[PDB]
Amino acid sequence: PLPYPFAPRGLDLDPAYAELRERAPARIRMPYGDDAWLVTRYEDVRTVLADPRFSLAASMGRDQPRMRPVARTGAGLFSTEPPEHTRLRSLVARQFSARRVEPLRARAGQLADELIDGMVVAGQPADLVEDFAIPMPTTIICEVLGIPAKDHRMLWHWAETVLSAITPQEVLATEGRAFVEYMVGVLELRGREPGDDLLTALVRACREEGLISEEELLSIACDLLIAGFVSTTNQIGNFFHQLLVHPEELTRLRERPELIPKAVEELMRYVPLLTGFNLARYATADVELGGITIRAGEAVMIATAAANRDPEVFQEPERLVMDRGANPHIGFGHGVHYCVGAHLARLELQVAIERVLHRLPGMRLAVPESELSWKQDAMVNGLQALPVAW
């Protein structure tokens, strides 16, 4: 069985995936848990994500293929399938819809300008990671959820604990307990002190309409916070890294920002992001796939970055093509667990690029590229620092 996941080399896609896509799904061994089938062919990955015989509910109570020593528990979005999943996801779908995140664009741009101001005053070189990529989306999600600004540093510390694949088992537990107790507290605050935030809406949904349990309310609050903290923070840095090493693409996006949406989608397709956070599904019945049979009770994982370069789906899949037209990438997933944050992340990535490129027309790497350090043992690929001058 193939040891998995591969060790990332920057944001290179591992060359093994090219051969993997042209054979039957492979048997893989993760750091912990059951062995699994690994699916990399685009069509095979879409099938796993859309076919209800592949279930995240069925993985609860199993010895899941995973990165960390303790199998995951919980009763929320990552643990359920329809109809129960639908009941939870319906309650969050209003606030994260494109229609309701779009009014945040002006605020996101104002925040980006404040962060860039801070970089300017601090003087060159700046670090796009610590000075911009981390603060921007963490602030925004906190505002969406009604989380006080004072808790930013504490929550980023928890995010780093969550993000490291070598966090000691007992550190994860003790910090985890503290985080959960923190969120219990916030949910009581929102109960006494209602606001125009998402958690207030979710507290009412639970404690006045009885539409979700307390355990579900808590899991959704925790999930949205953690997701908001570990995802875009890394991806913003990744996208600026890719723009900085393709300077030819910079000036088009700087001068014609209407081109930024398609570029964000191409960068979503191109960037290999998810080293560790790939939830295995368990089959609930035998499924024929890729010429093998996945028996009931077996585990299946997907490689979206590999699917996103399947040459049967994307022309010249290994080329970064910033105006790429046919781009049905799986960078936000597919099926019922399709990213509920997709419109918010999309807006954050577009605004980040628009603001940074306009504010800092002379932006460039402040160190040689070979000197960049990538985060080691991270569940999500990302830079330790991104030194820039301008």
**Contact positions toward ligand EIU, by CB under 6 A?**
68, 72, 74, 78, 162, 176, 226-227, 230-231, 274, 277, 279, 380
The answer to whether the peptide bond before residue 125 is cis (omega within 30 degrees of 0) is: yes
Give the whole-angstrom CA distance, residue 73 versus residue 54.
18
CB nearer ligand HEM, residue 25 or residue 331: 331
Question: Residue 147 binds which one of ligand EIU, Na ion, ligand HEM, none, with CB within 5 to 8 A depending on kind?
Answer: none
For 240, phi then psi, to 5°, come to -65, -35
Distances (CA, A) of 49 to 84, 274, 304: 17, 16, 10
Q: How far is the CB of 5 from Na ion (least distance, A)?
A: 40
Nearer to ligand EIU, 59 or 139 (CB): 59
Q: Taking each helix axis as running N to C, give the angle between helix 247-255 and helix 260-270, from 0 to 180 degrees, rounded to the nearest 10.
A: 150
240 is an interface residue for ligand HEM by CB under 6 A: no
From the list 166-174, 177-185, 208-216, 220-228, the region that binds ligand HEM by CB under 6 A is 220-228
- For 132, which DSSP code? I
Nearest Cα neighbor of 57 from 88, 83, 87, 78 is 78
Min dist CB 353 to ligand HEM, Å, is 13
For residue 254, give the nearest of 353, 169, 155, 181 by alpha carbon: 353
Judge contact between 323 and 260, C-beta under 8 A: no
Whole-number Cα distances in Å, 171 to 3, 126, 154, 158, 178: 26, 31, 15, 10, 11
- Tell the smallest beta-carbon distance from residue 203 to ligand EIU (Å): 21
> 4 to each of 26, 27, 162, 292, 373, how far by Cα in Å?
11, 10, 19, 20, 22
Q: Which of 40, 167, 231, 350 binds ligand HEM (CB under 6 A)?
A: 231
Decide if residue 237 touches ligand HEM (CB under 6 A): no
Number of residues that bind Na ion (CB under 5 A): 1
> Of 102, 112, 143, 74, whose CA–CA distance to 347 is shortest?
102
Q: Of these, 72, 100, 252, 358, which contacts Na ion (CB under 5 A)?
A: 358
Beta strands 387-389; 292-294: pairing state: unpaired
Q: Is 165 near ligand HEM (CB under 6 A)? A: no
Q: Which stretch binds ligand HEM (CB under 6 A): 12-20, 35-43, 183-191, 231-239?
A: 231-239
Q: How far is the CB of 343 from ligand HEM (least distance, A)?
A: 9
Q: How many residues does the chain have?
A: 390
Choices 4-12, 110-118, 214-222, 355-363; region in contact with Na ion by CB under 5 A:
355-363
CB atoms within 10 A of CB 332: 17
Binds 243, which of ligand EIU, Na ion, ligand HEM, none (CB < 5 to 8 A, cut-off by type)?
none
Furthest C-alpha separation in the chain: 61
Nearest CA to 125 out of 372, 378, 306, 375 is that of 372
Site membership for ligand HEM, residue 139 (CB under 6 A): no
Judged by beta carbon distances under 5 to 8 A according to partner kind, the member of Na ion, ligand HEM, ligand EIU, none in contact with residue 337 is ligand HEM
Q: Which of 84, 26, 32 is CA-nearest to residue 58?
A: 84
For residue 72, the partner it binds in ligand HEM, Na ion, ligand EIU, none, with Cβ less than 5 to 8 A by kind, is ligand EIU
Q: Does 105 bind Na ion (CB under 5 A)?
A: no
Under rule CB under 5 A, residue 390 binds Na ion: no
Which one of ligand HEM, ligand EIU, Na ion, none interacts with residue 358, CB within 5 to 8 A by kind? Na ion
307 binds ligand HEM (CB under 6 A): no
Q: Any contact of residue 257 with Na ion (CB under 5 A)?
A: no
Binding mask 300-339 for Na ion (x = CB under 5 A): ----------------------------------------
The phi-psi region of residue 132 (left if phi > 0; otherwise alpha if psi is between -120 and 50; otherwise beta) is alpha
Q: Take residue 25 and report the two structure tokens written for it.
A: 């799904």
Q: What does 4 bind: ligand EIU, ligand HEM, Na ion, none (CB cut-off 5 to 8 Å by kind)?
A: none
Note the residues at the interface with ligand HEM (CB under 6 A): 77-78, 89, 141, 223-224, 227-228, 231-232, 235, 273, 279, 304, 331-333, 337, 339-341, 344-345
Note the residues at the interface with Na ion (CB under 5 A): 358
